[PDB]
Design a protein around this nucleic acid. Structure first.
Ligand SMILES: Nc1nc2c(ncn2[C@@H]2O[C@H](COP(=O)(O)OP(=O)(O)O)[C@@H](O)[C@H]2O)c(=O)[nH]1
Ligand SMILES: Nc1nc2c(ncn2[C@@H]2O[C@H](COP(=O)(O)OP(=O)(O)O)[C@@H](O)[C@H]2O)c(=O)[nH]1
Ligand SMILES: Nc1nc2c(ncn2[C@@H]2O[C@H](COP(=O)(O)OP(=O)(O)O)[C@@H](O)[C@H]2O)c(=O)[nH]1
Ligand code: ALF
Ligand code: ALF
Ligand code: ALF
Ligand SMILES: [Ca+2]
Ligand SMILES: [Ca+2]
Ligand SMILES: [Ca+2]
Ligand SMILES: [Ca+2]
Ligand SMILES: [Ca+2]
Ligand SMILES: [Ca+2]
Ligand SMILES: [Ca+2]
Lengths: 418, 69, 421, 418
DNA sequence: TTTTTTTTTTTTTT
């Protein structure tokens, strides 16, 4: 019934706030937004002023901005200096404006869509005159809700936002591991899925100060920790397995244990959980300690909410939705490991494409970002350049698509930079 | 408008099983439980076969044990 | 007159209104249902509900939460919540009282499951063994995140321990694998008549006779009588054709007499029922481990196992499920489970007919679930004339303990026997 | 509870060697009825002398204590006599009485646990130990036992093990045609499948004394018999089917008919049967005459049990299962003829391999033995040595693999040794 | 909707 034009004027305030706090934060903000993207009339005017002052450039602080707003009839229209003062105290830091700007922008696009859709329907009843050209306008008007490098742009001239993974090249392409993202890491069996996830978890939990929850549905907590120890200290896994450790290995282990203690990584190895359970547990850990990342050791191993044992494709379709929504609710990146269907092993080229994600196509469709792992040496016994592993970033609606290379020293359960 | 049936003959079959019971072999070669018209006989002849698959074998005791089971 | 420290219950709730950092220990120890009084249940629930925002938890926000549902009047007034505050002077040893509330909770949980066992005794007079099992299982069940500090210790203490490993007796395989580890699912797959069962039987013998552990074998294709006859031949090097005819040389009977001797004290338990569900397998093993202890489970041939009711489902899912169940069985019994598997004909189509993981017949989830995947390949299976006949590759295509690779053994078929090189 | 109780006591007054199994299985307390308790006790009390146990000595023993009147009269003991179906299966009534005993023992210990739950609120861990312990208070074949049966079986080995085919070289390699085996005989069309199967059926039915059932789904009973006549008597098939017979042919036919009469071969030429139907018919023939072999002209012609007309590969996958299970149940070799896919023809070496079996790979898997027929003269018009035909034994889990040679004199519908 | 196994007509793989 009551239809409220979509907006988040909390997030709006968070953007303007960050600018008064930083103000190098105006660069990302304006790359992402124009003044009109803001819903509240007042913010429109403020963010306009902010850019107006940057074009001088003054630069942009609480003073100069009010100076610019008074320079036009506008300072009284937007609330007082007292409103501009509130905007400042909105956020603790001008950390991650990029995040909130992208919310404001996404909402803007939504109502632009709604508006052009309603005006198409509107015109459906009126211009009953020229059917084929009405269909062209509809085509064209729906594309224009979306907003090719020129030769000149390409002449800038010859000759992390972001929870950081610790893999430079991936981080450059991605910049974290962003709050609220669903990150899918899929690859054939025994290729390196878990290894890669665990490596990321360590570098986050040890290098940063954030807590990470890992749900392992296949491996025990014990086996997980043993993988991390080997990777932290470069101890050969076979040796560690057996207890057959060299005198310096003991040193390496003593160390590895040290650093992993203050690491703060919470592991849940219950073999059958529903997403609701996962949510519950994380909600509580965030409550009392704060959460940074959630890792899930594997999406199709999670189990369904009651809908009866439904068309299994729908069952996972649903798990997929739930996870994204959990990532959204807790404002935290969620890395979900996925399997792939065997169809890749038919191809003469064994690099996965999005279609290959096992069991339900909705996973491609819910993910904020899809990463495949490919290893030449998985297939070739003799393969030249062994330890190399491609991290194919097949999808991301932050930005760039592409492949990144790392080394996967298997004896050490370890991924390394090159 | 009363369905072709022959309860007398149904009883005679079930009866012979409790009497013999090697008579269950011909009986089951010829009939499945559903062939019986009376709901009750259906269940009894089923139980008889169910007990035979162990096989117990089939007498008045084991049959009632299976029916109570 | 059910068991309840309605005094101690108040002491907990009280401490929360007093502290309220005291809600953390409280909730680590208790869920709302642990409280006996209907009212406290609701209050402690509200307390946690508010904590999940988090508000946090004081006498105001709590009553705001209780009124937000129909519940504020149900639990006594604001005046009852006020009493809870005053019930205990200080809020230090909540841990104490919480553990009383918890212990009482467990008591009535016990009473309740014991009464429902007795209850079911009169009703389900249908299936005795699966009923007695429920009682066993229901009484154990009357016993969130694992903290890493704690795991690290167990793991160090475990590494302090120094084949790790139930040893197969095949040196090169054991070097690569070190057993046959507790809780692993080991898939052994290969084309028909290549040597699947032979290999598995050989492993079972060397385990049962060389070590002291018991091994359960579920044969769904061959009879127990055929299995034992294979092991006899392999134990004593008696030619199988001679043995199945009774056409034995004077020294063959000697060989048979010793073979029988050693296989007696062998302790290998064989179940040749041609149709079982995994549940059935589980039940039987659970019981054998109960009274004698189990070491290994061998299953001749995973796709022969039959599904739990889900209707005759997309067959790929049906085996998908069997796969999971097996891994979960290995996990629960803390014992390696060796499941033999067939392969689709796709490999036959290929140039080189060494199998890859994709080839496992009927469902891809098997590659996935397995801790370790072993393929058998024989050059002489395809070449009639093949140079070096008795050689057989044990291709270890998958293991998440460690290394991947190929191992070679000899498979003297006349003796149903695999040997080291 | 009851009535099974009466059946036990009854059998004892009837046998009374039935007291031995009864007491191995039951103690007096296992009986629910107070009276039976006392009676069964008295029975065992008299056995310890031992008297032994009949309707007299038992009432003498019950009167010897105050008990004869307490248990009903002599008249109740008389009824017990008349109240058992068959003396022979006490075992199965005893086991009912025993199972009921265990049930109330369970109920009684469970209620006393609940009872103790309210009382001994003193020491929780030792109470939970008691519960564990109070609720505790083979289905595998043991190897010791199998070894004996496997020994005694090798023992029964004075004097082919084996239903003999009459083809020496094949019999050497196989030794029958063993009870419970599924034998697959596959080969390209018009190569000689049926011919081979029929020849085996004859030599079994005429040379041995065993009955053989043949299910022909493609040819009529008439055509089958006519092939056997020609083979039995070496009468040229063209002559036979025209009636254009030489004076000595009429002799050969007269002889052929003679021996084939006492042959005992049962032919079912219904063109569409399910395996269930086959099973039923064989079950009944074995019932009243005994069965030795089953031959099926041709596995993929058999028709499915209802599962809807499923993925056809599964449909035959299932038929395959059913046949092996039938061979297992009737303890009789089952020869199932099979077709081959065209794959074999695309090759250079036209000799079939297991993969070639048409329609479902499960057939290779289920079979106890797989025989291919290959004829050089089937492909070469001019072929040197015509009547020779390979019997490729591609699979057997009795023993040896290998090729055997026979002659297939086609004019006579006959296979012969060399 | 998907994953699996089978047979058999096409094209194009240096
Ligand atoms: N050489 C060697 N390789 C190992 C060892 N441990 C594990 N690996 C390999 O590292 C990989 C880790 O398993 P993983 O890929 O995380 O399982 P996933 O979830 O299917 O991707 C496997 O491919 C193992 O073969 C070891 O001790 N030595
Ligand atoms: N020359 C000749 N050949 C015959 C005669 N009758 C049958 N045959 C041969 O025997 C073969 C019978 O093959 P059959 O066993 O029925 O085919 P399958 O069941 O598909 O293996 C045919 O290919 C004929 O060539 C005959 O009268 N003369
Ligand atoms: N040469 C020979 N081989 C035999 C004998 N007995 C059994 N075998 C072989 O051993 C193998 C049995 O393989 P098996 O493991 O049962 O088949 P799978 O379970 O499907 O892999 C077959 O290749 C048989 O030919 C014998 O007496 N002589
Ligand atoms: F081998 Al995995 F997930 F454990 F593919
Ligand atoms: F010979 Al098999 F499974 F193919 F026992
Ligand atoms: F032609 Al046929 F079996 F008779 F293949
Ligand atoms: Ca994994
Ligand atoms: Ca969706
Ligand atoms: Ca797909
Ligand atoms: Ca997004
Ligand atoms: Ca086998
Ligand atoms: Ca591997
Ligand atoms: Ca034919």
């Amino acid at each position: 019934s009551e239809r409220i034009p979509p907006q988040s004027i909390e997030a709006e305030q968070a953007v303007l706030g960050a600018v008064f706090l930083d103000p190098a934060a105006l660069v990302p903000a304006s790359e992402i937004l124009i003044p009109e993207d803001f819903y509240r009339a007042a913010h429109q005017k403020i963010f306009h002023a902010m850019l107006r002052v940057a074009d001088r450039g003054e630069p942009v602080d609480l003073v100069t901005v009010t100076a610019e707003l008074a320079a036009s009839e506008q300072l009284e229209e937007i609330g007082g200096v007292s409103y501009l003062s509130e905007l400042a105290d909105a956020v603790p830091t001008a950390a991650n404006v990029e995040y909130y700007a992208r919310i404001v922008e996404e909402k803007s696009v939504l109502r632009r869509l709604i508006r052009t859709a309603t005006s198409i329907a509107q015109d459906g009843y009126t211009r009953e005159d020229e059917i084929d050209v009405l269909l062209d306008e509809a085509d064209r008007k729906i594309m224009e809700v979306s907003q090719f490098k020129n030769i000149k742009d390409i002449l800038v001239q010859t000759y992390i936002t972001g929870i950081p993974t610790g893999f430079t090249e991936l981080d450059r392409m991605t910049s974290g591991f962003q709050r609220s993202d669903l990150i899918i890491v899929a690859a054939r069996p025994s290729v390196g899925k878990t290894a890669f996830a665990l490596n990321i978890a360590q570098n986050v939990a040890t290098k940063t100060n954030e807590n990470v929850a890992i749900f392992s549905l296949e491996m025990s907590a014990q086996q997980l920790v043993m993988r991390m120890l080997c990777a932290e200290g470069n101890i050969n896994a076979q040796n560690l397995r057996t207890g057959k450790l060299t005198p310096e290995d003991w040193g390496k282990l003593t160390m590895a244990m040290g650093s992993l203690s203050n690491a703060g990584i919470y592991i849940d190895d219950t073999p059958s959980i529903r997403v609701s359970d996962i949510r519950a547990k994380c909600r509580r850990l965030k409550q009392e300690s704060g959460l940074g990342m959630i890792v899930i050791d594997y999406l199709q191993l999670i189990q369904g909410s009651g809908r009866s044992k439904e068309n299994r494709q729908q069952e996972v379709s649903e798990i997929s939705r739930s996870l994204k929504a959990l990532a959204r609710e807790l404002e935290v990146p969620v890395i979900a490991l996925s399997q792939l269907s065997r169809s890749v092993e038919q191809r003469q080229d064994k690099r996965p494409m999005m279609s290959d994600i096992r069991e339900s196509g909705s996973i491609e469709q819910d993910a904020d970002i899809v990463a495949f792992l490919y290893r030449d040496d998985y297939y070739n016994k003799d393969s030249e350049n062994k330890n190399i592993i491609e991290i194919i970033i097949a999808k991301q609606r932050n930005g760039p698509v592409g492949t990144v290379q790392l080394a996967f020293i298997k004896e050490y359960n370890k991924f390394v930079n090159l | 408008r009363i369905p072709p049936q022959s309860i007398e003959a149904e009883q005679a079959v079930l009866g012979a099983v409790f009497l013999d019971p090697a008579a269950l072999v011909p009986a089951s070669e010829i009939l499945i439980p559903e062939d019986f018209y009376r709901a009750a006989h259906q269940k009894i002849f089923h139980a008889m076969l169910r007990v035979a698959d162990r096989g117990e074998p089939v007498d008045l005791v084991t049959v009632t044990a299976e029916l109570a089971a």
